[PDB]
């Protein structure tokens, strides 16, 4: 069932190595038997280093190993998927997701991210997690939002629990967290922008795993945010969540998208800036949104264009980017100088 022929070096190459020292005119059978003899000693020593590492008990052979070799009819009532024990464990998980004590919070987060083999307090868990997402979208409460979104983050990093089959009741809750109207209070929309940042960051963590298949991920979320950006007369939370989600998709994504949207969204800027009579909620909202997305979009064209001619680059970017685009280009040159 096996045949072990002799691994014999080509003797002409051996004569090349030999007469590299300039020996003589060599006949073949000499170097043939030389390769034979050296192959015997090599394969003997190979068995020997195998005896080494099969008592050092590793199946990989290092240089050091050979160095040491060189010392020579009513049915029965049902039963759930849970145990009572692990469903009470699940209740601990849920009320720690409620948990005010941040120690209990982080305990829950680690318990999510590092319980592999759990898999069975899967979807039911995640399913009316998503239902709680919908109900608290109605309730419009940022604390439940941040708790669930860090919960989804910790769900995303528990490496065994594969997402695939159970994806499709989770991602829309993320995007509903992205879109709009996270309005606890009008002076307190501030944390919601960071919520959207974190959410789009989570989407970026999603998108690197699943769009090999059916392209729900890339094609649907991109066209979603595309036509969402097209949606005129919408609140700027929608615009921020859309453009932030497109920002999280990557360098070349923005290179495609904000190539016309550079000056088109600059037109949106100077529709907002030097714009209305008075709506300072929307003014301050859209203004810091445009500023954030400006200097967050900046490293694309910084990697794309050289940082010359900031007066021309503002003309190349409809003026309002100038010189905040130029200041971000100075910051990018400083970050390059840090390297």
């Amino acid at each position: 069932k096996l045949k072990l022929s002799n691994t014999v070096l080509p003797s002409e190459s051996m004569k090349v190595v030999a007469e590299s020292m300039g020996i003589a005119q060599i006949q073949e059978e000499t170097c043939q038997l030389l390769t034979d003899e050296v192959s015997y000693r090599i394969k003997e020593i190979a068995q020997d280093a195998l005896k080494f590492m099969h008592m050092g008990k590793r199946q990989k052979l290092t240089t050091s190993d050979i160095d040491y070799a060189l010392k020579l009819x009513x049915x029965x009532x049902x039963x759930x998927x849970x145990s009572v024990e692990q469903q009470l464990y699940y209740k601990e998980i849920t009320e720690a997701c409620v948990g005010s004590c941040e120690a209990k919070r982080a305990e829950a987060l680690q318990s999510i991210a590092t319980d592999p083999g759990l898999y069975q307090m899967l979807p039911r868990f995640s399913t009316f997690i998503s239902e709680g997402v919908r109900v608290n979208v109605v309730q419009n409460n940022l604390a439940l939002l941040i708790y669930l979104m860090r919960m989804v983050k910790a769900l995303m990093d528990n490496p065994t629990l594969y997402l695939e089959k159970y994806v499709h009741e989770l991602i829309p809750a993320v995007m509903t967290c992205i879109v709009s109207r996270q309005l606890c209070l009008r002076p307190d929309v501030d944390n919601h922008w960071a919520l959207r940042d974190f959410a789009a960051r989570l989407v970026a963590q999603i998108c690197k795993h699943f769009s090999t298949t059916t392209n729900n991920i890339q094609s649907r979320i991109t066209k979603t945010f595309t036509k969402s950006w097209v949606d005129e007369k919408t609140p700027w939370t929608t615009r921020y969540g859309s453009i932030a989600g497109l920002a999280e998709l990557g360098h070349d994504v923005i290179k495609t998208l904000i190539l016309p949207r550079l000056q088109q969204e600059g037109e949106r800027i100077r529709s907002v800036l030097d714009g209305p009579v008075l709506s300072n909620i929307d003014r301050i909202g859209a203004d810091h949104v445009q500023s954030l997305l400006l200097k967050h979009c900046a490293p694309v064209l910084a990697k794309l264009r050289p940082p010359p001619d900031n007066q021309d680059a503002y003309r190349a970017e409809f003026g309002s980017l100038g010189p905040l685009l130029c200041s971000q280009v100075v910051k990018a040159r400083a970050q390059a100088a840090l390297q």
């Binding site: 039963x79 849970x82 009572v84 464990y89 680690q110 590092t114």
Partner: protein, 202 residues
């Protein structure tokens, strides 16, 4: 893999000594081979001193031991102060690098339930019940007496009014008001041939 950085640290020492020499260029594989030769020279010192200070019944290799070792290993030690003028006085010492950490975690369930049960050994840590043990789910008691018979009687009332609505709109219908097919469509009279066999029949 993680062993390798000390070997490349020795390569850094090699480059430092070449800088003290003054070679602008080099042959890289020869440099690393010389580095291997250096670490084998270190280990050769160590083997020599190892088997040499076992000639005492005690272990600790002292200074003159290593003196006789290096003279045994062929070196004029008299240049060692003078080489100090080259060594710690013309080459800057490089620093080491080791970035070790112990991360934090917390997975607090509340179940131990057997500290050192019958196989008693007070050197372990019982995991939980949340992973190891299991349970059983019956999940449906529903035994609320008056509520139960409320359910049953309400359902009987439902089937009453259902069949009433069905044969109401089905058969001959006469009303209470005019044209109540919605609210009260009473079945009209059959009258049939033999009443007594019907009305006196259990």
């Amino acid at each position: 893999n993680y062993h390798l950085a000390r070997r490349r640290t020795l390569q850094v020492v090699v480059s430092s000594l070449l800088t003290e020499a003054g070679f602008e260029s080099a042959e890289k594989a020869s440099v690393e081979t010389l580095t291997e030769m250096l670490q084998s020279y270190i280990s050769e010192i160590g083997r020599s001193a190892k088997s040499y200070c076992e000639h005492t019944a005690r272990t600790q290799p002292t200074l003159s031991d290593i003196v006789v070792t290096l003279v045994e290993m062929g070196f004029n030690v008299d240049t060692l102060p003078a080489y100090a003028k080259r060594s710690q006085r013309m080459v800057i010492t490089x620093x080491x690098x080791x970035x070790x950490x112990x991360x934090x975690x917390x997975x607090x369930x509340x179940x131990x339930x057997x500290x050192x049960x019958x196989x008693x050994x007070x050197x372990x840590x019982x995991x939980x019940x949340x992973x190891x043990x299991x349970x059983x789910x019956x999940x449906x008691x529903x035994x609320x007496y008056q509520v139960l018979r409320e359910k049953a009687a309400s359902q009987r009332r439902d089937v009453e009014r259902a069949l009433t609505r069905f044969m109401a709109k089905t058969g001959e219908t006469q009303s209470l008001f005019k044209d109540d097919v919605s609210t009260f469509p009473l079945i009209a009279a059959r009258p049939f041939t033999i009443p007594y066999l019907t009305a006196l029949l259990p």
